[PDB]
From a paper:
The Picornaviridae family of single-stranded, positive-sense, non-enveloped RNA viruses includes several pathogens of concern such as enterovirus-[name] (EV68). The 3C protease cleaves eight sites within the viral polyprotein, with a preference for a glutamine–glycine (QG) motif at the P1/P1′ positions, a preference distinct from host cysteine proteases. Among strains of EV68, the amino acid sequences of 3C protease and its cleavage sites are highly conserved. We have determined and analyzed three high-resolution inhibitor-bound crystal structures of EV68-3C protease, which revealed possible sites of resistance mutations, a key structural water molecule conserved during ligand binding, and the conformational flexibility of the catalytic histidine H40.
Rupintrivir demonstrated the highest potency with the IC50 value in the single-digit nanomolar range, followed closely by [name]. Within the active site, rupintrivir and [name] exhibited identical hydrogen bonds from P4 to P1′, with one additional hydrogen bond formed between [name] and C147 backbone nitrogen. At P2, [name] lacked the fluorinated phenylalanine ring of rupintrivir and was unable to pi-stack on the catalytic His40. In this structure, we observed the catalytic His40 in an alternative conformation, where the side chain was rotated furthest away from the substrate-bound position. Between the S2 and S3 pocket, [name] contains an aromatic ring incorporated into the peptidomimetic backbone structure that protrudes outside of the substrate envelope. In this region, the mutation of Gly128 into a larger amino acid has the potential to interfere with inhibitor binding and confer resistance. As [name] is an analog of rupintrivir, this compound shares many structural similarities and protrudes in the same regions, highlighted at the S4 pocket, where the isoxazole ring forms the same hydrogen bond contact with Asn165. At the S4 pocket, the mutation of Asn165 into a larger residue could preclude binding of the inhibitors, while other mutations could remove the potential for hydrogen bond formation, potentially decreasing inhibitor binding.
Residue numbers in the entry: 1 to 182, 184 to 188
The structure:
């Protein structure tokens, strides 16, 4: 069976509704006041979290050493609540996965779970014309409004949903080394 119980506990405590100029996205909180959102959401200086306008204190659009989009943007928010630290649920390496759950938390869909089946390390994807790397694939007709959706197996948060074409769906990997504590001018 899919890990429905695990997906639920991640959604209860570590998701919020994020709204940018592009619209609403499920947003996974990872630790403290640090969360993720698809890069194509176009995060700016402020963002709405659960319909509350919130200062975006930092935003890092991840790219790899080939200078290629990874479709993950990490944000640091000015909010009073800390997110439960779930970094230990993150995969250390790239991997293929069995029988995963995709979970959405938006205004339209406050609590919804989609078993997407097997998830394979896809690698390169031309995402809406942007070369992208480190992509996970599932053969499932995901749909508009599900970007940012959290992809889990039991015990692991493996990525967030970033696109699809009516036949397959795609998530950007989440790796533990993206959120370890570490001087670097990054803007
Ligand atoms: C999520 C965006 C969203 O939720 O926005 C909230 C405001 C959707 C999810 C897609 C739509 C249909 N099925 C899905 O899983 N993302 C998109 O529509 C993305 C966003 C980006 C970038 N998008 C835009 C343009 C093209 C595509 N798809 C492809 O390029 C593609 C290539 C292959 C193979 O499969 N898809 C896309 O996902
Ligand atoms: Na909107
Ligand atoms: Na950051
Ligand atoms: Na680790
Ligand atoms: Na509504
Ligand atoms: Na192919
Ligand atoms: Na396109
Ligand atoms: Na929609
Ligand atoms: Na296909
Ligand atoms: Na750490
Ligand atoms: Na850590």
């Amino acid at each position: 069976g899919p890990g429905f119980d695990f997906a639920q506990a991640i959604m209860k405590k570590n998701t919020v509704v994020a709204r940018t100029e592009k619209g609403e996205f499920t947003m996974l909180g990872v630790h403290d006041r640090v969360a993720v959102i698809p890069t194509h959401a176009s995060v700016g200086e402020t963002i709405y979290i659960n319909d509350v306008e919130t200062k975006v204190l930092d935003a890092c659009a991840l790219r790899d050493l080939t200078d290629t989009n990874l479709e993950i943007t990490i944000v640091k928010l000015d909010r009073n609540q800390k997110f439960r630290d779930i970094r230990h649920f993150l995969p250390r390496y790239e991997d293929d996965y069995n029988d995963a759950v995709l979970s959405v938390h938006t205004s339209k869909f406050p609590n919804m779970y989609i078993p997407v089946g097997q998830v394979t390390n896809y690698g390169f994807l031309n995402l809406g014309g942007t070369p992208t790397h480190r992509i996970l694939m599932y053969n499932f007709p995901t749909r508009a409004g599900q970007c940012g959706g959290v992809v889990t197996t039991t015990g692991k948060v493996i990525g967030i949903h970033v696109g699809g074409n009516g036949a397959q769906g795609f998530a950007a990997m989440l790796l533990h080394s993206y959120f370890t504590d570490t001087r670097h001018h990054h803007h």
